[PDB]
């Protein structure tokens, strides 16, 4: 439910969840493309402050 909880992980587990096909995966990976951030990162400051 948070973009910071989705940026710090790869899509290898996205396809593990059923009903995650070509539409959802491409949409998610292209929305972040317009935002510049990359799917799968490494940050320790999480979550500030929630």
């Amino acid at each position: 439910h948070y973009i910071g909880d989705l940026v710090q992980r790869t899509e290898v587990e996205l396809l593990k969840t059923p009903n995650l096909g070509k539409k959802s995966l491409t949409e998610i990976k292209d929305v972040l493309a317009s935002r510049g951030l990359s799917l799968g990162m490494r940050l320790e400051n999480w979550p500030p402050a929630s």
Partner: protein, 330 residues
């Protein structure tokens, strides 16, 4: 739309220069560019549009690599074991279908890609066809004698080029005459005219003799050396491995008839059939003939030959810019 695609692939202008599979790949590249211009992001698409009869069914390339830059064409190796990819590069999958291959901008970019592809076709075809005549002399009228080079019509959409450095201030040009030479280099991976013909190379005259001199070509004689200062002096040194022929007596013709003919063909350049010997001493003695030499010395560590000339035949020893010597050193 498929009917129009079949009509286009069937009614191509050059069925020989643009083969069928080449039309297929050209249409595929055009549709790829169209699909690229479709989406805002950068995603490469392969087509494979049913080569024989049917319509298109596009795909989506993904470029398996651990990177993420431009994620439209990114799939990490770890997150690729699904779909049974199991590979490291070549994840060209069918995630993308439903392309539009007819609309305005797509039709325009397809026409442009087709123009580029037929140009590339014509180029490759003419080059790898007329390249077979690389050692032998080629004929053909000139297209246009520009500054940096000249372009020559070799026939049916056939083109060659002769560079400016190999030209002469007295060698003389305008669209419409035919100048020959030897195709000396072919760069089929270039961007334009890539059939490079020269005229200053020595073996040219050798090849020339192969059309006129009947003694050459049957190996009974041996044309060894050719010293060519273009416009200055074009001497030839032949050798006879047989025991019933003369090196200079037969190849000269009948009192300057065939040698004079090939000289006028080369541009009236002074041609003197010299006789080289098995040793460099007599070789340079003959190359600077008719004249005397007071000293012939060879030096290996300096890679040089000292030729000191006596007084009495200077008018035949030096000439213009040391031409009578300039060939020997060359």
């Amino acid at each position: 739309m498929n009917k129009e695609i079949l009509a286009v692939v069937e009614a191509v202008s050059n069925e020989k220069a643009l083969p069928r599979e080449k039309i297929f790949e050209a249409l595929e590249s055009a549709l790829a560019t169209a699909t690229k211009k479709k989406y805002e992001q950068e995603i490469d698409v392969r087509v494979q549009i049913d080569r024989k009869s049917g319509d298109f069914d596009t795909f989506r390339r993904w470029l398996v690599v651990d990177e993420v830059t431009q994620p439209t064409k990114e799939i990490t190796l770890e997150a690729a074991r699904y779909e049974d990819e199991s590979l490291n590069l070549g994840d060209y999958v069918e995630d993308q279908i439903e392309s539009v291959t007819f609309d305005r901008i797509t039709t325009q970019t397809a026409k442009q890609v087709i123009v580029q592809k037929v140009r590339e076709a014509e180029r490759a075809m003419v080059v790898d066809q007329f390249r077979e005549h690389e050692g032998e002399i080629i004929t053909g009228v000139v297209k246009k004698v520009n500054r940096d080079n000249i372009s020559l019509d070799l026939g049916n959409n056939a083109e060659a080029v002769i560079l400016r450095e190999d030209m002469l201030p007295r060698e003389n040009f305008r669209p419409g005459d035919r100048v020959r030479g030897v195709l000396y280099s072919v760069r089929p991976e270039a961007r334009g005219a890539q059939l490079f013909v020269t005229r200053s190379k020595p073996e040219m005259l050798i090849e020339l003799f192969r059309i006129e001199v009947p003694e050459i070509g049957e190996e009974v004689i041996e044309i060894k050396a050719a010293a060519r200062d273009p416009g200055s002096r074009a001497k030839i040194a032949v050798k006879t491995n047989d025991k019933r022929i003369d090196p200079v007596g037969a190849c000269v013709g009948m009192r300057g008839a065939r040698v004079q003919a090939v000289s006028t063909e080369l541009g009236g350049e002074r041609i003197d059939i010299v006789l080289w010997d098995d040793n460099p001493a007599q070789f340079v003695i003959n190359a600077m003939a008719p004249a005397d030499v007071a000293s012939i010395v060879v030096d290996e560590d300096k890679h040089t030959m000292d030729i000191a000339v006596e007084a009495g035949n200077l008018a035949q020893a030096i000439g213009r810019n040391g031409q009578n010597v300039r060939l020997a050193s060359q």
